[PDB]
């Protein structure tokens, strides 16, 4: 089996990508995050706090005729972010792009934070890191991909992120049509759960490559490019006026700049994100200050290569029985 749909920005940064999602029988199509950060599929429902609902498509169990409560089972999770949410536990059919999954774990939320309940776009998170991450207690639930592996024609799937424009999540095969060149596979550790690898470097605009490991995550979920801070200094010293800012949270730029490109190295290939990927536009609505989209992790505790550089590359996530990532141009 094979499944492939179609990621779309949520505004017009490309703050996160929905992906649409059809939970239950008859169906309830709901727009969820698809997340190879974390480990959890969760939604809005009709058990979520009302006043913490403002706009989402609900799940509601009671209406589909293949939900079951998962008895004693609840959940829990915090982001990187600083969000959060929790509830209950339902299993239900859920299908992707064509490809369905019987008996997936559903996680009602019964609590979101503020940042949830704000983004009226996002209907829920669907993860796509390791199963050892999933927050069910007492019984730890597997990701709609583990759940789908095995009836897939190759343990896979791909990212291929638009810039401010839809793209496709594809599960079970590699669109050859999708990407430039070959792809680059890396190896992966999933000793913390995540995607994670070794970046072999990177450049600043057309400067001179810099050949370092960089560990870090592939993580569709974070909007931004988090690296340590004397490659993001390297990189911002190229910004006539960039500043990190302690009131803003990061680095801003004059939004009068070109900025410069990053190249980030996988093996012996190399991912080139161009400047603009890196604007983040005002830091208030007709401010001159800008948001970079390259911020340093230090504090975070791992780097994160997120939408930012992902969206750069057409990306495979390979979940044979020695995983590795795949990065190719496109
Ligand atoms: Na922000």
Redesign the pocket.
């Known amino acids: 089996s094979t499944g492939s749909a179609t990621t779309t920005p949520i505004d017009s940064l490309d703050?996160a990508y929905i992906t649409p999602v059809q939970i239950g029988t008859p169906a309830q199509t709901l727009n969820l995050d698809f997340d190879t950060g974390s480990s959890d599929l969760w939604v809005f429902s009709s058990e979520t706090t009302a006043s913490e609902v403002d706009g989402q498509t609900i799940y509601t169990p009671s209406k589909s005729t293949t939900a079951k409560l998962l008895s004693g089972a609840t959940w829990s999770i915090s982001y990187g972010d600083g969000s959060s949410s929790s509830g209950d536990v339902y299993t239900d059919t859920v299908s992707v792009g064509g490809l369905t999954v019987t008996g997936q774990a559903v996680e009602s939320a019964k609590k979101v934070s503020s940042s949830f309940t704000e983004d009226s776009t996002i209907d829920g998170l669907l993860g796509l890191a390791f199963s050892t991450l999933n927050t069910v207690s007492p019984t730890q639930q597997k990701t709609f991909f583990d759940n789908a592996k095995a009836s897939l024609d190759s343990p896979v799937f791909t990212a291929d992120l638009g810039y401010h424009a839809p793209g496709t999540y594809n599960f079970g095969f590699i669109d050859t049509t999708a990407y430039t060149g070959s792809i680059t596979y890396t190896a992966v550790s999933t000793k913390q759960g995540f995607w994670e690898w070794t970046s072999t470097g990177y450049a600043v605009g057309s400067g001179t490559f810099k050949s370092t490991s960089i560990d870090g995550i592939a993580d569709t979920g974070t909007?931004l490019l988090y690296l340590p801070a004397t490659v993001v200094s390297a990189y911002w010293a190229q910004v006539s006026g960039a500043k990190s800012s302690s009131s803003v949270?990061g680095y801003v730029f004059p939004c009068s700049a070109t900025l410069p490109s990053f190249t980030f190295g996988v093996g012996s290939a190399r991912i080139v994100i161009p400047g603009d990927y890196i604007d983040?536009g005002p830091?208030s609505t007709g401010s001159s200050s800008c948001?970079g989209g390259i911020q340093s992790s230090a504090g975070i505790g791992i780097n994160i290569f997120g939408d930012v550089a992902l969206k750069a590359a057409f990306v495979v996530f390979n979940g044979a029985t020695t995983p590795t990532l795949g990065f190719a141009s496109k």
Do not use: K, L, N, W
């Open positions: 703050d909007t949270g983040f830091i948001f």
